[PDB]
Design a protein around this ligand. Structure first.
Ligand SMILES: O=C(O)Cc1cccc([N+](=O)[O-])c1
Ligand SMILES: [Zn+2]
Length: 257
């Protein structure tokens, strides 16, 4: 099955998921000089005061912080979006070293990591139906750089030892994702895809300009996770990022001057 190795990594995904070579794949390089300011874009509205995290999961590709999405409790609206998108999970992508890890790039710059907060459009009723629609998901992407620790991340880091290997989960209640957000909500937006199989072209991407800072110690704990299951040969969970894909016939829009 797909993964991030030599034999099963991004460069192979098209054989099982031919949409990998589609017209609206993600991530992309954001060329800041050609992304045009769009005065018609709105401020993003991130409303996470009632978010209810439940659990953290090592799915063998990353770890997922999961939310109860059975009511409108944590929603993303505004920005480029029409309607209301409910938070279902967040996860990260990261590198073996601080010089790579992000999926999106900014003028070819790679960040150490990228956080994806995934939301589904309530007009389609459930996540599985939303991913079948071109406006089904809104993913908020946030870059991570290594410097100061992010106090709001530490709860996540400290639970990772309990989900070392693929298929492990653990209770993870009361975690507040507001602690992961940067000060500014300035963003770039473009139409794209999931960045893991099945690579469905269902996402409005909203990539924040301002990275968050995490400490080296924090990211080092991400790199102690395993892609393998309990008791199998250890292969560290690192470099679980898809590289930038062709922009094709897309425009990247900026919310800011
Ligand atoms: O399980 C998966 O890898 C598919 C999936 C599910 C939810 C979000 C995703 N994304 O690219 O942001 C991808
Ligand atoms: Zn992702």
């Amino acid at each position: 099955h797909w993964g991030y190795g030599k034999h099963n990594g991004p460069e192979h995904w098209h054989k099982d998921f031919p949409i990998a070579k589609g017209e609206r794949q993600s991530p992309v390089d954001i060329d800041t000089h050609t992304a045009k300011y769009d005065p018609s874009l709105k401020p993003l509205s991130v409303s996470y005061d009632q978010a209810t995290s439940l659990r953290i999961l090592n799915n063998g590709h990353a770890f997922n912080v999961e939310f109860d999405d059975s009511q409108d409790k944590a929603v993303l609206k505004g920005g480029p979006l029409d309607g209301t998108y409910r938070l279902i999970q967040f996860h990260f992508h990261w590198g073996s070293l601080d010089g790579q890890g992000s999926e999106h790039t900014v003028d070819k710059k790679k960040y150490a990591a990228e956080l994806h907060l995934v939301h589904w459009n309530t007009k389609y009723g459930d996540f599985g139906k939303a991913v079948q629609q071109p406006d089904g998901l809104a993913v908020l992407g946030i870059f991570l750089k290594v410097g100061s620790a992010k106090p709001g991340l530490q709860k996540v880091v400290d639970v990772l030892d309990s989900i070392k290997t693929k298929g492990k989960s653990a209770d993870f209640t009361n975690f507040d994702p507001r602690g992961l957000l940067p000060e500014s909500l300035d963003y770039w937006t473009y139409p794209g895809s999931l960045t893991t199989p099945p690579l469905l072209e269902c996402v409005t991407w909203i990539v924040l300009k301002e990275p968050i800072s995490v400490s080296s110690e924090q990211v080092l704990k991400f790199r102690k996770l395993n892609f393998n299951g309990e008791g199998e040969p250890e292969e560290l969970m690192v470099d679980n990022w898809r590289p930038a894909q062709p922009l094709k016939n897309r425009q990247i829009k900026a919310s800011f001057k």
